[PDB]
Design a protein around this ligand. Structure first.
Ligand SMILES: *[C@@H]1O[C@H](CO)[C@@H](O)[C@H](O)[C@H]1NC(C)=O
Ligand SMILES: *[C@@H]1O[C@H](CO)[C@H](O)[C@H](O)[C@H]1NC(C)=O
Ligand code: NA
Length: 430
């Protein structure tokens, strides 16, 4: 019997009693694909208008509201928009007098429909709108939503049941040691490798292709609080699920209002008319309180909060050299029969793998090359966490056979057991 320590850095090697070289460090895991993640980005636009527009929409307000921001914010999540009448028509017009601007603006909406809220704002300063010979007219439009920026969207895979893979070369023979499989064959004996514990769960941030690594769940209560994982979750990179901020709170705030001495809260948008340099024109100053009290800068966050490679303990590895040889057990090399795979892959819920193991010894069962355990001949049933999609090639170590599968992807699993969207009901007349 012999013992030596093997360091875990590139170039690390021992020579006695049998040479062992650290060839590399990799990792194995049970992947949980979360889909797409992005920060909650509160974006706002609008316009100060020296008119009472009759169509409160991006197209209807095209003469005042910036085109591209309006269209982008309108299509955003949890949209909020308000149209305020600061100074209405004194006479004439069409549903443009002050009387049409009752709280909630139902009278104006009757003739001028809009998806936006309509409110009176009489008493607010109309100083921004000037150059009217008679009848000063002014209105303010504000539009805000949570926009998903493609440059801030990251694909995230959670790595569970993580196993650091210490790739060794034992006298020229490849041996990959983990906490699950720490044994190696040596010329005339066995090597047992003492390994440090596994690092726990990992977070794989997929940049678009490059992978960046986080260590943990992540912890949304610590320095990684601003992680997109802690924010907007889209399992199929299309539909939103779970926790969502409320619709933004829009306020018309005059330039001299003492409220401006304080900062807006998260999800709050304050709009201030700016006096125009031109007659019958005005600008708009927008103050928005971002979700989580800060705006996430994606390349910068990833650079500081992730590593290029997954983390592993420093080692060293304990090399226990023994003269013992493992007992030769009979192995069945024929493929397994009537294999059925049911459930999901890369989801975190073990899939059901059932079939018939053939004769000749234990079947070292693989599902698309993934080890799912060894089974004695006859009927077998196992719950395995699968990382590969269907079709499933099943083997006992020799020839492979095609299994029957009813396996869904991680996005489909995220929508299984739920009915997505609006819940509609009707109350009939008596
Ligand atoms: C160890 O891992 C490498 C890379 O995946 C592979 O090429 C090699 O065959 C593995 N060795 C054994 C003994 O499984
Ligand atoms: C919707 O809800 C009302 C009560 O609020 C009735 O129960 C109606 O039958 C519901 N609709 C359906 C299809 O069940
Ligand atoms: Na007026």
């Amino acid at each position: 019997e012999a013992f030596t320590y093997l360091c875990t850095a590139p170039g690390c090697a021992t020579q006695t009693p049998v040479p062992v070289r650290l060839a590399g460090v990799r990792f194995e895991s049970k992947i949980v694909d979360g889909g797409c993640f992005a920060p909650w980005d509160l974006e706002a636009t609008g316009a100060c208008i020296c008119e009472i527009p009759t169509d409160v929409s991006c197209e209807g307000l095209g003469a005042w509201v910036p085109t591209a921001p309006c269209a982008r914010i309108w299509n955003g999540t949890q949209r909020a928009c308000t149209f305020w009448a600061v100074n209405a028509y004194s006479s004439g017009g069409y549903a443009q007098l002050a009387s049409y601007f009752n709280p909630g603006g139902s009278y104006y909406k009757q003739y001028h429909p809009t998806a936006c809220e309509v409110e009176p704002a009489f008493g607010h300063s109309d100083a921004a709108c000037w150059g009217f010979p008679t009848d000063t007219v002014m209105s303010v439009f504000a539009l805000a939503s949570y926009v998903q920026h493609p440059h801030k969207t990251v694909r995230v895979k959670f790595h569970t049941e993580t196993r650091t893979v210490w790739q060794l070369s034992v006298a020229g023979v490849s041996c990959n040691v983990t906490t699950e499989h720490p044994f190696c064959n040596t010329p005339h004996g066995q090597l047992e490798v003492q390994v440090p514990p596994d690092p726990g769960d990992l977070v794989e941030y997929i940049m678009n292709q490059q992978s960046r690594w986080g260590l943990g769940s992540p912890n949304c209560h610590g320095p990684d609080w601003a992680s997109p994982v802690c924010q907007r979750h889209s399992p199929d990179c299309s539909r939103l699920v779970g926790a969502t901020p409320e619709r933004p709170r829009l306020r018309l705030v005059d330039a001299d209002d003492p409220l401006l001495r304080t900062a807006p809260g998260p999800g709050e948008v304050w709009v201030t008319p700016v006096i125009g340099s031109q007659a019958r024109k005005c600008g708009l100053h927008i103050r928005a309180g971002p979700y989580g009290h800060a705006t996430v800068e994606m390349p910068e966050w990833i650079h500081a909060h992730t590593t290029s490679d997954p983390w592993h303990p420093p080692g060293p590895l304990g090399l226990k050299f023994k003269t013992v040889r493992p007992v030769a057990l009979p192995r069945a090399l024929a493929p397994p029969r009537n294999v059925r795979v049911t459930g999901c892959y890369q989801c975190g819920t073990p899939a059901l793998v059932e079939g018939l193991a053939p004769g000749g010894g234990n079947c070292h069962l693989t599902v698309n090359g993934e080890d799912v355990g060894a089974f004695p001949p006859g009927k077998f049933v196992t719950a395995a966490l699968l990382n590969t999609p269907p079709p499933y090639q099943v083997s006992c170590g020799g020839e492979s056979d095609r299994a029957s599968a009813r396996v869904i992807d991680p996005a489909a699993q995220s929508f299984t057991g739920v009915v997505y969207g609006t819940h509609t009901t009707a109350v009939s007349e008596t």
